[PDB]
């Protein structure tokens, strides 16, 4: 079980320099006396790594508490520990570090390692209580107070200890690199005796691979496991802990860098060069030996001509009168601009059944022709306007062939077509000799022969007129209410388009390197005011016949010349 410690009080960060530490063997291939260029997650040279005391005594009284914060895990971590008394014991890696997400626990007792991937319920201050035996004192017994419970364990590993026994200035440096790539937790390690160096020593030591775990979890944060030799119940005035936290640990974060590594004759990495550190290192990498690129445009400009020829969709959707359901109002739309956003964004309509085309990319598609069908129907019959459907309207009125490309849009029309006394101007056939073909318009009024005798245009026994009228009233139920319906069938053919979407333009930035798009001509460069004169029918300019030096902006007719951004 876990034991609550005091608040960490958010000690301010402190930094130190990493003089070319953290180089690990990237591959498992022996190379001798060769210089190899590898692009991988390396700790950049001469970087700032943040260092924490294992035990910090900052209070005026002398309060002694672990500096054990939860730190991010950004594309790998370089973790070094300088210590002499084995007060760092392991780490815990995860995203939420609770029973909500899987966590990886690595701990080293005096005998072996314990590696678990489970559902740990980590406490706020996970730790190990260390006590010697009364007679031997050769080894330290540890009480784990790291997690409250563990579930759903999917991994287990035990091996020789990661951290050697440290049982008085014989400080030791232990360096680890943790990477989490492709479902693999890769640990590289190295141990080096240190002497009289408080911070990271100046030198070079390569980190040989230690282990590859196929844990395959998500890690975003990590923490450090520390051991109290002291007692949490009774904190001593001083010296109960280990010399006020002389030992400490430094954390740095890996980054994608290109390194030049020098394998010597015995196959060990003796030196490395960080290609992004100085211009010098850049030269060394370019020559693969130890002995206009400046301007990049930030914004984009699109300039297109005005959207003038606009659809008479208002003459269709805002029309006062919609034709009878057996005189379907089919209207041509062409040679003009189509803004479907106005209709879709308004969403004042009830339906947007768009088939073969998604309704949000209609503005991006300029079609050849548009057919706009306008009328009013009952709501319960609105479901019948789609291909492959049947019913009185779908079979007898207006057949939609199974291969539609287009949109059906219907909206409530109770306050527009309905009257108190019933609006019977909308006529509806219930009988026909046969079903239709798609988009057929039958406006015949011949009386249908329900019996065996001919009607000769006269109703009677088994003789009925085709059209019955509809009782549109403002008190009718939702199914019996009027519904204004328009079907837009869009033609996508190997023919030039006449109905296009609202080509949206932008603002203009001059005298700055920018991505530009003038009338479909796309490029990258800087724009200036030019004294060239274009003839009214001319749009671009090409003085050298292979690059467009000048252009005429579509909206404001000034002529801007294009200088290549690369100086």
């Amino acid at each position, epitope marked *: 079980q876990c034991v609550n410690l005091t608040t960490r009080t958010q000690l301010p960060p402190a930094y130190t320099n990493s003089f070319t530490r953290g180089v690990y063997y990237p591959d498992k291939v022996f190379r001798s006396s060769v210089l190899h260029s590898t692009q991988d997650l390396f700790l950049p040279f001469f970087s700032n790594v943040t260092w924490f005391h294992a035990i910090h005594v900052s209070g005026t009284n002398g309060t002694k508490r672990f500096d054990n914060p939860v730190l991010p895990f950004n594309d790998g971590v370089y973790f070094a520990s300088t210590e002499k008394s084995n007060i760092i014991r392991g780490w815990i890696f995860g995203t939420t570090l609770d029973s909500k997400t899987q966590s990886l626990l690595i701990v080293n007792n005096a005998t072996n390692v314990v590696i678990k991937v489970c559902e740990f319920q980590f406490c706020n201050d996970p730790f190990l209580g260390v006590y010697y035996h009364k007679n031997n004192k050769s080894w330290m017994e540890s009480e784990f107070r790291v997690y409250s419970s563990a579930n759903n364990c999917t991994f287990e590993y035990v091996s020789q200890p990661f951290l050697m026994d440290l049982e008085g200035n014989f400080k030791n440096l232990r360096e680890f690199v943790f990477k989490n790539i492709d479902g693999y937790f890769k640990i590289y390690s190295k141990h080096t005796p240190i002497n009289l160096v408080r911070d990271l020593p100046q030198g070079f030591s390569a980190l040989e691979p230690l282990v590859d775990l196929p844990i395959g979890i998500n890690i975003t944060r990590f923490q450090t496991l520390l051991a109290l030799h002291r007692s949490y119940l009774t904190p001593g005035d001083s010296s109960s802990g280990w010399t006020a936290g002389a030992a400490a640990y430094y954390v740095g974060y890996l980054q994608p860098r290109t390194f030049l590594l020098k394998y010597n004759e015995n196959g060990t990495i003796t030196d490395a060069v960080d290609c992004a550190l100085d211009p010098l290192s850049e030269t060394k990498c370019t020559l693969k030996s130890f002995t206009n690129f400046r301007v990049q445009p930030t914004e984009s400009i699109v300039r297109f001509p005005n959207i003038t020829n606009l659809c008479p969709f208002g003459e269709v959707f805002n029309a006062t009168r919609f034709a009878s359901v057996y*005189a379907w109002n089919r209207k041509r739309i062409s040679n003009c601009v189509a803004d479907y956003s106005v209709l879709y964004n308004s969403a004042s309509f009830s339906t947007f059944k768009c088939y073969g085309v998604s309704p949000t990319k209609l503005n991006d598609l300029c079609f050849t022709n548009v057919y706009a069908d306008s009328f009013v129907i009952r709501g319960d019959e609105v479901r019948q306007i789609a291909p492959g459907q049947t019913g009185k309207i779908a079979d007898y009125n207006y057949k939609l062939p199974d291969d539609f490309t287009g949109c059906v849009i219907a909206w409530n029309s109770n306050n527009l077509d309905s009257k108190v006394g019933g609006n019977y101007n909308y006529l509806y056939r219930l009988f026909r000799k046969s079903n239709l073909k798609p988009f057929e318009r039958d*406006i015949s*009024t011949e009386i249908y022969q329900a019996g065996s005798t001919p009607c000769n245009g*006269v*109703e009677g026994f088994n003789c009925y*007129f085709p*059209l019955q009228s509809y009782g549109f009233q403002p008190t009718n139920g939702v199914g019996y209410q009027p519904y204004r319906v328009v079907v837009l069938s869009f033609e996508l053919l190997h023919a030039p388009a006449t109905v296009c979407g609202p080509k949206k333009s932008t603002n203009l930035v001059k005298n700055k390197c920018v991505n530009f798009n003038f009338n479909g001509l796309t490029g990258t460069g800087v724009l200036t005011e030019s004294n060239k004169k274009f003839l009214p029918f001319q749009q671009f300019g090409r003085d050298i016949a292979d690059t467009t030096d000048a252009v005429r902006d579509p909206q404001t007719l000034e002529i801007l010349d294009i200088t290549p951004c690369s100086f």
Partner: nanobody
Amino acid sequence: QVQLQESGGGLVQAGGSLRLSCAASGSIFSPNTMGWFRQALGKQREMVAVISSIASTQYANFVKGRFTITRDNTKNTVHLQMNSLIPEDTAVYYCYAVDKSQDYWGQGTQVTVSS
């Protein structure tokens, strides 16, 4: 604005005759179809009769052999001769222009027959 002008109704004693006229103006494209519809207070539009450009005439069984429709091609107008009138014909009548597109109705003609 397609307009249908209707006239010629009123009050007539049982057995009399009336002559309604209905003239179409506006678009009225050539393949048109003019019909007359009946309604009494409390009932639905009763389709009296129908004529197309084919010159065919279609009548309902209600007024068998009694009402007739005449055409004027020069003015493209329609005329109902309503003879042998009965109290059961007491109903307001309207014109229906089938045409090819958006159908147009009239304003109404009162026809009253009683004794």
